[PDB]
C-alpha cells in the first residue's frame, strides 16, 4: 500500500547527483555528500556572526536533520540512530539508538531548547531532553513532519486509517499547554513525468517545507504550491487556516500572463509579509549545491481571477479595484495577526506598534478605494457597508468627501449617524 | 602538547584576542622562505586573516641568524608571532634570549599571562622538550605525535624538572637516559603545515576551493622525499575534493573545476612534449637508466612499442594529436608493464578554469619550486644573496594568485631550463664517477661543471640530491647509504654541503628513515674549530670553507652518528 | 472523487429538460434547457407575500441557495455567482470567484447578512450581502453548505480527511467555530433512478438545513433525518436520528414494502418535517410538484418483526409509550437548549414546555402501568425516578395501590418527600 519516507523540512532528493540538502530553513542549510559508502555532512549558517559553519564525516548515513538556533539533530531512519550536536561546543554531543520494530522507520525529528523529539512510522513519539535522558514514549498517529521553533512544536500526522491531521503544542520550561492534538489539516495531497516522480518517490506527502513565521504562527507549503498560515491558533474556537500565497498565481503574474513551468518556489521562511524562498529555475523543483540568494515574495491574498486580468490587459497590471480588495483583505488578516501576537506574546522589538498603525492606515486606504468604486456605480448600500467596516475616525471624513463628490446626501446623513454612534 | 588538533580553533581565537584591532598592527608572521609548504601555509593564513581583517606583517626568513636579527628589532607592541615551517627543533628561549620575567603581565591565584605569543608551525618531528612542555610563551601546533609517542619523555621531563644517593641517581640518570635517547634522533616529517592549517580552517569554517587547492599544493610538494606523508594525507584530500565540488557540464569561462583524474608521475607533462616528459623524469631515468646511451635506445624502443611516433611525441602536449593522448591511459596500461614503469599510473588533482588550460598539482609545485630557485667583503655578498632569494620567494608568492598566470608560465619555462641543467650535471656526475664509497656514507663533491652558480641555491642542490637518490635507489647492488653532496662557490669560496637521506624504491610498500646528519654536524662543530654555518632551517645544509672541507669529512667518517 | 455541485433538495435532469435547483420552506428554483440557453423560474410557496419570477440564463447556473430575502446562483465551472434580492429596491450583483485548474464550486449559501461560496479544494470564501469579501479560508473540501442568521453549517469530504462537518458562527467582532471538522455520522450510499441520482449527487445528501429553532438537520441517502442536539456546548453534542423515513413509509403503507413512494425533505419545523411525498419510479419530484405535506418526528425504536407479528398498523401500548417518552425527552432538552440561550422567538413555547412535560409524564405513567402489570418492583421504581413533577406521583401511587404492591409505595412516598422537602 503506502510507504513512509523520512522527512526533513525543505530537504532535497539525491536525483542523478551524489549530494543533497538534508534541511534548509532560516537558520541555515545542512547538506550531505555521498563519499564512497560514507557521507560528508556540511552545516552552513545564514547568520555568519552568531554561528560558525562546520562539517563532519558521517559514517552512519544520516538522512534526517533538524537545525535550530541552539543545536543540530541528525537522524538515521533505518536503524534509529540519532545524534544531537550543540553549536557552541560547550555542551557535549550525544548519540542514541531508539528501538525500531520491523518496518519501523524514523519519519521526522525535531529539537527544542529543553527537549528532543523523534517520531516513527508506526506512530511512536519519543521525547528526550537536550542531554539524552528519555522523558516520554507517546503513541500517536504516524508523524510525517515535524518543525519546532523555541518551545512551540508543530507536527503533521498521516495514516490510512486516521487521515491527514496536525498537532500544535507549547511545552516550555513551564506551563505545559497543548494547543491542538491531531485536528484535521486542510491541505491537498498530490495527485499520484519523471521530474515530479523523482521528488514524489522521495517526498510522497508533497510537503515542500514546514515552518513557523517570524512571530510564531505556523505555516505549511503543500504540493499545490500554496502557503497556509494558521491564524488565531491560541484560541481553539476561533482558529482558521489562511492561504496567503498561491505562488503559482504570482509566478504566472510576474511572467506577463505566460503559463510558466520552468520556475518553481522552494520555501524557506516567512518574515512579516514576506516569504524568503529560492526561485528555482530548471526542470527540477529542488535547488542544487551552488545555492543562489533566496528571493523575497510578498504575500498576496488569493482573490485574483485570471479571466479578468486577461480581459483588461487585452507584466500583468492589476486594476485598482481588486488591488484595493486584496490590499484590504491582506491588511485585515495581517492586522489581526499582528494584534494577536502583540497582545499575547508581546513585542519582541520596537517596530511592531508603528507597523501595525501603518497597516491599519493601508487598511483604511484600501477601504476608501473600495468605497469610491461603490459610489461610482450609485451604490449607496454597498458604500455604507464598506464605510461601516472603516476602522479609524480619521478616514471617515474622506468618505464624506467622496460622498460629496458622488452626490449621495442620504449616505452623508447615515455616515454622520455612524459618527454620532462613534463619539460615545 | 599545548595545542592538540581539536583546539587549533581555540588558538586562532587567542590570536584574535591579541590582534583583532583596526588601529594598530599586532600580528607578525615569520615564514621560513625556500619552502613550498610554508608558502602555501602562509597563503592560506593570509587569506584567512584578510577575510576577517587582521593586520599582519609577513616576513620571510632564510637563516637562524636572520631570525635572531628580525626578532631582536621587533617592537614591543607586537603580541602575536607565527613561526611557519621552522622553530620546532631548537630551544627558542635559549636562542632568542627569552626570559619570562620581563614578558609577564598580570600574574595575579595560579594564572599566568604574557604580553607576547609566539606560535610554531613546524613539521620537523624532533620536538624540543623544553619548547613543547616547559614553555608557556612558545605555543606549538602539534599534529598529535605527543599523545601517542612522546608520553614516556613527558613523564621523564616532568620528574626531571620537579625533583631539582642510589635512589636519586637511579631514577634521575634513568630519566636523563630516556631524554638523551629521544634526543640524538634523526629528523623526519610525517605531516604538512598546510594540512594542519586546513584542519584549523575546517574547525573554524572558512574552507573553500582556493584554500583546498593551496592545501593540495602543500601536500603534493612533499611527494619527492616524503611519499608516505602524501600517501597518508591523500584520502582526506579526496574526501575534501568530493565534498566541495559542485553538482556537475559544458566548458564555460567562469566554472573552475578541480578533478581527481590520472596525473602521471612525470615532469611537466601538460606543458612540455611527451618525449621531454619521459626524458627528464626522475622515475623513468631511475628505472630505465636514461643517463647512458643504452637508456636512450630503450626509450626510443618503447616509443616504437607504444605506437607513438617521435614526431608526435616531441610535439607539444597542447598541440598533440589526441588520437595519442585520449587513450594514453590504455597505452600506459598495456605497454609500461614490460619496461617496469607500472608506477607511472597515479591519480592526482587537476585544476582548470575558463579556457586557459589545465594544471596539475605536481606541475604547479615544480613551477613554484623553480620560482623559488632561479626566480630572478663576503658578508655583503651573502646579505645581497639572501635578499635575492627573499625576492624570489615573493615572486613565487605572486605566482600563487589566479590573475598572474604569466608568472606561472615563467615558472614553467624556468622549471624546464633548471631541469635541463640538473639533468646535464647529473649525467656529468654519473659519467665520470665522482660518487665515492666511504663504507658508512656516499660522497659526491662537485669541483667544476656546467653552470655551477645555480648550486649556491639550497633547493637546486636538493633537486640534484633527489635526482641522485632516485637514480641510485633503484640500483639494488649498492645498499641504502646516506649521501653528502658538496658544491663549491668560487666567489664566496665555500663548499655548501647537503645531507641527503636514501629511500626505498617507489614500487615497494614501512618505517621511514631518519636524517642523521644534523647530530654529526653539531658534534663536529662543537668539538672542532671549523668556521661553519648552521643557520639553515634544514639542519643538513651547512657551509664550510674550501680548506677545511677534507678535515670535516675525515671527522665525519670517523664519527659513527651517520 | 467526483465533487459534483450541491444545492439543497436539488433534483437531477434525468433525460428531461426541466429540473429543480433548490427547494426550501420559502420556495423552489427550477431550470429549463432551451436552445443551448437556460431559463430559471423561481417560485415561492407563500404566494401572498410576493411574486414568482422567470429570468434568462446564458451561463448555466447549476448552483442555487434560496432564502427569504434573496437568491444566490452560482456556476460550478466558471465560478460566476450572482445574488438577486427579491424586492427591486435592492440591486442584484454578480461576482466571478477565482478558481484553479480543475477547481469547482461545490455549494453556495446565502444569509441576510452573509454570502458564502464553498469550493472543491476547500476554499471557503465569505462576502457580505453586497459582494464585499470578508474572509478567504482553506478548509477540508466542501461538499455541502447551508446558513441562516449568521450560522453556517458545512459538510466536508475528501480522500484524506473523510466525512466531517463544521458549525461556524459569525458575530460582528470575531468568528466562532463550535465544532470544527468533527466527524459526521451520515452513512454514504453504496436501478436507473439510483444511477442517475448518485451520478448527480455522489454524497447522497438529499437535503441539509437548519431547524426552525436554529438546530442543524441533515437528510442523507439512508432516508434518516438527523438533528444535531446540544450543539451550543461542544462537549455534550449528540447527533440524534429523529426520523427513519423508511420506517414511517412502511408504517403508512400498512406493513407492506413499497418501491413507488419515497420522500423529499424541504425543512423542519417543531415536531413537523415539511417535505414532498414523491410518487413514481424516481425518487425526486417531477413537474407537477404537489402541495408540501408534513411528517411527524418518530424516533426509530420500532421493530419491524414485532409489528408484523402483532398485526394502518396498530402500535402496541408499551412501544407507543416508549416512543412518546423518548420523543418528549429529546424535544424537551432541545427546546430548553433553545430558549435558555436564544430567548423566545414566537412566544408560544412557554406553554409548549408545559404541554410537552405533561405528555412526558403521561408516557412515563403508561410505562409505569405497563411495568406494574408484570409485577416488576425495581423496574417501576427506576421509572418512578425519572418523573418530572409532583402531580404524576399521585397517579403513580394510584396505580401501585391498584396492583396490591406496597413495597413500591414505601419508596415512592420517600422519593416524594425528598422531592418536595428538598
UniProtKB/Swiss-Prot annotation, chain A:
Transmembrane segments: none annotated. WD repeats lie at residues 222-262. It is found in: Nucleus. Present with 3280 molecules/cell in log phase SD medium. Accessory factor for DNA replication. It plays a role in accurately duplicating the genome in vivo. This is DNA polymerase alpha-binding protein. The gene is CTF4. The chain holds residues 473 to 923 of 927 of the full protein.
Curated annotation (Swiss-Prot), chain B:
Keywords: Cell cycle, DNA replication, Nucleus, Phosphoprotein. InterPro entries: CDC45. Disulfide bonds: none annotated. It is found in: Nucleus. GO terms for cellular component: CMG complex; DNA replication preinitiation complex; nuclear replication fork; nucleus. It comes from the Eukaryota. GO terms for biological process: DNA replication initiation; double-strand break repair via break-induced replication; mitotic DNA replication preinitiation complex assembly. One of its GO terms (molecular function) is chromatin binding. Pfam families: CDC45. Required for initiation of chromosomal DNA replication. Acts at the origin of replication. Also has a role in minichromosome maintenance. Assembles into a complex with MCM5/CDC46. Interacts with MCM10. Belongs to the CDC45 family. PANTHER family: CDC45-RELATED PROTEIN, CELL DIVISION CONTROL PROTEIN 45 HOMOLOG. Present with 1730 molecules/cell in log phase SD medium. This is Cell division control protein 45. It comes from Saccharomyces cerevisiae (strain ATCC 204508 / S288c) (Baker's yeast).
Amino acid at each position: 500500500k503506502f510507504r513512509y519516507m523520512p522527512f526533513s523540512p525543505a530537504g532535497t532528493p539525491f536525483g542523478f547527483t551524489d549530494r543533497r540538502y538534508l534541511t534548509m530553513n532560516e537558520v541555515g542549510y545542512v547538506s550531505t555528500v555521498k563519499n564512497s559508502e560514507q557521507y560528508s555532512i556540511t552545516v552552513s549558517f545564514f547568520d555568519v556572526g552568531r554561528f560558525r559553519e562546520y562539517h563532519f564525516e558521517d559514517l552512519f548515513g544520516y538522512d534526517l536533520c533538524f537545525l535550530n538556533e541552539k543545536g543540530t539533530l541528525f537522524g538515521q531512519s533505518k536503524t534509529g540512530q540519532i545524534q544531537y550536536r550543540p553549536h557552541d561546543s560547550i555542551h557535549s554531543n550525544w548519540t542514541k539508538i531508539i528501538p525500531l520494530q520491523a518496518g519501523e522507520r524514523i519519519t521526522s525529528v525535531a529539537a527544542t531548547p529543553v527537549r528532543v523529539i523523534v517520531g516513527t512510522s508506526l506512530g511512536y513519539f519519543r521525547s528526550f531532553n537536550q542531554f539524552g535522558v528519555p522523558f516520554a514514549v507517546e503513541k500517536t498517529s504516524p508523524i510525517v513532519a515535524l518543525t519546532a521553533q523555541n518551545y512551540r512544536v508543530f507536527s503533521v500526522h498521516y495514516s490510512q486509517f486516521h487521515g491527514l491531521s496536525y498537532s500544535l503544542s507549547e511545552l516550555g520550561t513551564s506551563s505545559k499547554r497543548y494547543y491542538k492534538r491531531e485536528c484535521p489539516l486542510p491541505m491537498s495531497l498530490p495527485n499520484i513525468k519523471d521530474a515530479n516522480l523523482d521528488y514524489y518517490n522521495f517526498n510522497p506527502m508533497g510537503i515542500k517545507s514546514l515552518f513557523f513565521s517570524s512571530y510564531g504562527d505556523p505555516c505549511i507549503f503543500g504540493s499545490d504550491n500554496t502557503l497556509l498560515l494558521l491564524s488565531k491558533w491560541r484560541s481553539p474556537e476561533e482558529s482558521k487556516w489562511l492561504p496567503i500565497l498561491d505562488s503559482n498565481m504570482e509566478i504566472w503574474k510576474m511572467s506577463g500572463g505566460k503559463e510558466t513551468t520552468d520556475i518553481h518556489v522552494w520555501p524557506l521562511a516567512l518574515a512579516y509579509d514576506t516569504l524568503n524562498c529560492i526561485l528555482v529555475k530548471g526542470k527540477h523543483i529542488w535547488p542544487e549545491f551552488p545555492l543562489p540568494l533566496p528571493s523575497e515574495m510578498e504575500i498576496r491574498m488569493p482573490v485574483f481571477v485570471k479571466s479578468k486580468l486577461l480581459e483588461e490587459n487585452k507584466e500583468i497590471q492589476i486594476p485598482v479595484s481588486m488591488a484595493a480588495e486584496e490590499e484590504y483583505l491582506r491588511s485585515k488578516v495581517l492586522s489581526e495577526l499582528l494584534t494577536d501576537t502583540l497582545e499575547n506574546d508581546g513585542e519582541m522589538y520596537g517596530n511592531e506598534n508603528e507597523v501595525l498603525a501603518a497597516l491599519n492606515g493601508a487598511y483604511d486606504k484600501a477601504l476608501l478605494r473600495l468605497f469610491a468604486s461603490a459610489c461610482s456605480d450609485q451604490n449607496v448600500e454597498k458604500a455604507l457597508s464598506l464605510a461601516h467596516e472603516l476602522k479609524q475616525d480619521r478616514a471617515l471624513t474622506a468618505a464624506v468627501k467622496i460622498s460629496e463628490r458622488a452626490e449621495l446626501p442620504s449616505l452623508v446623513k447615515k455616515i454622520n449617524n455612524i459618527r454620532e454612534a462613534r463619539y460615545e | 602538547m599545548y595545542y592538540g588538533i581539536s583546539q587549533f580553533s581555540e588558538a586562532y581565537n587567542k590570536i584574535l584576542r591579541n590582534s583583532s584591532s583596526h588601529s594598530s598592527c599586532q600580528l607578525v608572521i615569520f615564514v621560513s622562505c625556500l619552502n613550498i609548504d610554508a608558502l602555501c601555509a602562509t597563503k592560506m593564513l593570509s587569506l584567512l586573516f584578510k577575510k576577517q581583517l587582521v593586520q599582519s606583517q609577513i616576513v620571510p626568513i632564510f637563516g637562524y641568524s636572520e631570525l635572531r636579527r628580525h626578532y631582536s628589532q621587533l617592537d614591543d607592541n607586537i603580541n602575536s608571532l607565527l613561526l611557519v615551517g621552522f622553530g620546532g627543533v631548537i630551544d627558542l628561549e635559549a636562542f632568542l634570549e627569552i626570559d619570562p620575567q620581563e614578558y609577564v603581565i598580570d600574574t595575579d591565584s595560579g594564572e599566568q599571562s604574557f604580553r607576547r605569543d609566539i606560535y610554531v608551525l613546524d613539521a620537523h618531528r624532533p620536538w624540543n622538550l623544553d619548547n613543547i612542555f616547559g614553555s608557556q610563551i612558545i605555543q606549538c601546533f602539534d599534529d598529535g605525535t605527543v599523545d601517542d609517542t612522546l608520553g614516556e619523555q613527558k613523564e621523564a621531563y616532568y620528574k626531571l624538572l620537579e625533583l631539582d644517593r642510589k635512589q636519586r641517581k637511579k631514577q634521575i640518570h634513568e630519566y636523563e637516559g630516556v631524554l638523551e635517547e629521544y634526543y640524538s634522533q634523526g629528523t623526519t616529517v610525517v605531516n604538512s603545515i598546510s594540512a594542519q592549517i586546513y584542519s584549523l580552517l575546517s574547525a573554524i569554517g572558512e574552507t573553500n576551493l582556493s584554500n583546498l587547492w593551496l592545501n593540495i599544493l602543500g601536500t603534493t610538494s612533499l611527494d619527492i622525499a616524503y611519499a608516505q606523508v602524501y600517501n597518508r594525507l591523500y584520502p582526506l584530500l579526496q574526501d575534501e575534493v568530493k565534498r566541495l565540488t559542485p553538482s556537475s557540464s559544458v566548458k564555460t569561462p567562469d566554472t573552475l573545476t578541480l578533478n581527481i583524474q590520472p596525473d602521471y608521475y612525470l615532469f611537466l607533462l601538460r606543458h612540455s612534449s611527451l618525449y621531454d616528459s619521459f626524458y627528464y623524469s626522475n622515475y623513468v631515468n631511475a628505472k630505465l637508466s636514461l643517463w647512458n646511451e643504452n637508456g636512450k635506445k630503450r626509450l626510443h624502443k618503447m616509443f616504437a612499442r607504444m605506437g607513438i611516433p617521435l614526431s608526435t611525441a616531441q610535439e607539444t602536449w597542447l598541440y598533440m594529436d589526441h588520437s595519442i593522448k585520449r587513450e594514453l591511459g590504455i597505452i600506459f596500461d598495456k605497454n609500461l608493464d614490460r619496461y617496469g614503469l607500472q608506477d607511472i599510473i597515479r591519480d592526482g588533482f587537476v585544476r582548470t578554469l575558463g579556457y586557459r588550460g589545465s594544471i596539475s598539482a605536481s606541475e604547479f609545485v615544480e613551477a613554484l619550486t623553480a620560482l623559488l630557485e632561479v626566480g630572478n667583503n663576503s658578508a655583503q655578498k651573502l646579505t645581497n644573496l639572501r635578499k635575492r632569494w627573499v625576492s624570489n620567494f615573493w615572486l613565487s608568492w605572486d605566482a600563487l594568485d589566479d590573475r598572474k598566470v604569466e608568472l606561472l608560465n615563467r615558472g614553467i619555462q624556468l622549471a624546464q631550463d633548471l631541469q635541463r641543467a640538473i639533468f646535464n650535471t647529473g649525467v656529468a656526475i654519473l659519467e665520470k664517477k665522482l660518487i665515492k664509497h666511504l663504507r658508512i656514507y656516499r660522497l659526491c663533491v662537485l669541483q667544476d661543471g656546467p653552470d655551477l652558480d645555480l648550486y649556491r641555491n639550497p633547493l637546486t642542490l636538493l633537486r640534484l640530491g633527489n635526482w641522485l637518490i632516485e637514480c641510485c635507489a633503484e640500483s639494488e647492488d649498492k645498499q641504502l647509504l646516506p649521501m653528502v653532496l658538496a658544491s663549491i662557490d668560487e666567489n664566496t669560496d665555500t663548499y655548501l654541503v647537503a645531507g641527503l637521506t636514501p629511500r626505498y624504491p617507489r614500487g615497494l610498500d614501512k618505517k621511514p628513515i631518519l636524517n642523521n646528519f644534523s647530530m654529526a654536524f653539531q658534534q663536529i662543530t662543537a668539538e672542532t674549530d671549523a668556521k661553519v654555518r648552521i643557520d639553515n632551517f634544514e639542519s643538513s645544509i651547512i657551509e664550510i670553507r674550501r680548506e677545511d672541507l677534507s678535515p670535516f669529512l675525515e671527522k665525519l667518517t670517523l664519527s659513527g652518528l651517520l
